[PDB]
Each structure stands twice: as structure tokens, then as C-alpha cells.
Paper text:
In this work, we investigate the mechanism of activity of anti-CRISPR protein AcrIIC2Nme. This 123-residue protein was previously shown to inhibit the activity of Neisseria meningitidis CRISPR-Cas9 in vivo and in vitro. We show that AcrIIC2Nme functions by inhibiting loading of the guide RNA molecule, thereby preventing formation of the active CRISPR-Cas9 surveillance complex. We found that it blocks Cas9 binding to sgRNA, thereby inhibiting biogenesis of the surveillance complex. This interference is mediated through an interaction with the arginine-rich bridge helix, which connects the REC lobe to the NUC lobe.
To better understand the precise mechanism by which AcrIIC2Nme inhibits Cas9 activity, we determined its crystal structure to a resolution of 2.5 Å using single-wavelength anomalous diffraction (SAD). Consistent with these previous observations, AcrIIC2Nme shares no sequence or structural similarity with previously characterized anti-CRISPR proteins. We also created a mutant lacking the final 12 amino acids (Δ112–123), which were not resolved in one of the apo crystal structures. The crystal structure of AcrIIC2Nme revealed a highly negatively charged surface that binds to the positively charged bridge helix. Mutation of this electronegative surface decreases the affinity of AcrIIC2Nme for Cas9, resulting in loss of anti-CRISPR activity. To determine if the interactions between AcrIIC2Nme and the bridge helix of Nme1Cas9 are required and sufficient for anti-CRISPR inhibitory activity, we mutated 19 residues distributed widely across the surface of AcrIIC2Nme. Mutation of three of the four amino acids that make direct contacts with the bridge helix (E17A, E24A, D108A) displayed a complete lack of anti-CRISPR activity in vivo while the other mutants showed changes in activity of less than 10-fold. Circular dichroism spectroscopy of the three mutants with abrogated in vivo activity revealed spectra similar to the wild type protein, showing that the lack of activity was not due to a folding defect. In addition, cooperative thermal denaturation curves and melting temperatures similar to the wild type protein indicated that these mutants maintained stable, folded structures. We conclude that the negatively charged surface of AcrIIC2Nme and the positively charged Nme1Cas9 bridge helix comprise a critical interaction interface that is required for anti-CRISPR activity.
Residue numbers in the entry:
A (entry chain A): 0 to 117
B (entry chain B): 1 to 117
The structure:
């Protein structure tokens, strides 16, 4: 929806979520491609800002195979729900845009602890 | 329908924050599903209310937009409904939205308590 999308654009691009009773966290991406995702951490996760820029990978996990994002730094993005109803005209470009957004989300998450420290 | 079920995989109430904003956010993953902005009055205390949260829905600003006033300093605004269907009955839709907003406001009040305990 163009109307709905215009309302989405009045939101910050990356929203970090939490829920009572949950150790997993959450995310909302309000710019195209829009989605809601579960943000989870590996046991070894540090939360530290990395020297290199975030370069994750999109892939399939589990049985049945489901789309997941591996930040390669302990952060995972899962259970994606797309908030745009249009189907992407080109899939390869959609995967690239989704992966780039996930990399942005992971780096933004790493900024959370630093901000709290300062 | 199929997107609604993946919504069923999530907790009912999700509390959000964004870098650079003082306003907070909420995602309601049960019907009626939406994303909203959670804002606070200057004098908001966050101390648990003696009586149950009983907010009201109404219209604010010019042009008039739907907003929820918890009556305890918490506001929900800029509602983006995540269900595509239009409700058959509007006043029952408003009642369900209001009930979800009261639950969201009480859950937000519980956040501080949780951090203390
Ligand atoms: Mg497995």
C-alpha cells in the first residue's frame, strides 16, 4: 500500500524490539523491503562492534527449510514476515536488498551497547 | 492468513526503541495486528496504577488521526494495521483495538518493575 508505506516512512528505519518473558529480541525494518523478524544471539555472542564492516549471509535453516540471516557475528535474523504485499519483480535483487538491510540491522544492533556504555 | 500464522510465532506484545529517538514503538502481533508509536508525556512516572489501565481511543491533531491515550502518560499513535482485511464492524474493531492498547500500556508499565526485580 502506497498509503501504508507513506505511514511507514514516518518511522525510523530500524526498530529494535524486546518482549517480556523472551530472551530473543526483535526487529522491524520500515523501509523497503519491509519486515518483522526475530533477532537471536548465539551463546558466544559478545555484542561488540567489529572492526570490519558487517557482511552476513542469507540462507535456509531447519527442516522445513526457512529463510534466515546469519550475521556471522552471533546475531541471527529469523522468522521473516514481509510487510509489503507486492511480490518482487526480480528475486536476485530482492535477496540483495534484504541482505543489505540485514547487514545494516546487525551493525545498528552492535551500536546499542556502545551507546549504553557512553 | 498465512502471514497471520507466522505472526502467531511471535510474542503478543513487542516493545521497540530506535537509535536517535526518544519515542518508543510497539508491535501487536495478535488481532488486530499493528505497529504503533509509543510516546510519553513529560510527567509520566511509570509507576503501576492502583486500578487497571483504562485508556481511551480518539482523534488528535489537525488533520484528525486515531490515537490512544492511556490516561497515565502513555500514548499510542500513528497506527499501521498489519492485517489487510477491513473489519466488518467498526465499533467492535475499536473495542478490540482499545483492549489491546490497555494490555500494551500495562505491559509497558511492567517493564520497569521487571528491570528492578
Ligand atoms: Mg537444525
Amino acid at each position: 500500500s502506497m498509503s501504508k508505506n507513506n505511514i511507514f516512512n514516518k518511522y525510523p528505519t530500524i526498530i529494535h524490539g524486546e518482549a517480556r518473558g523472551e530472551n530473543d529480541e526483535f526487529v522491524v525494518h520500515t523501509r523497503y523491503p519491509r519486515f518483522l523478524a526475530r533477532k537471536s544471539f548465539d551463546d558466544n555472542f559478545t555484542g561488540e562492534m567489529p572492526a570490519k564492516p558487517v557482511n552476513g549471509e542469507l540462507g535456509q535453516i531447519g527442516e522445513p527449510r526457512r529463510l534466515a540471516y546469519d550475521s556471522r557475528l552471533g546475531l541471527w535474523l529469523s522468522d521473516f514476515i514481509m510487510l509489503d504485499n507486492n511480490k518482487p519483480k526480480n528475486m536476485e535483487d530482492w535477496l540483495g536488498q534484504l541482505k543489505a538491510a540485514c547487514d545494516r540491522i546487525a551493525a545498528d544492533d552492535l551500536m546499542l551497547n556502545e551507546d549504553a556504555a557512553d
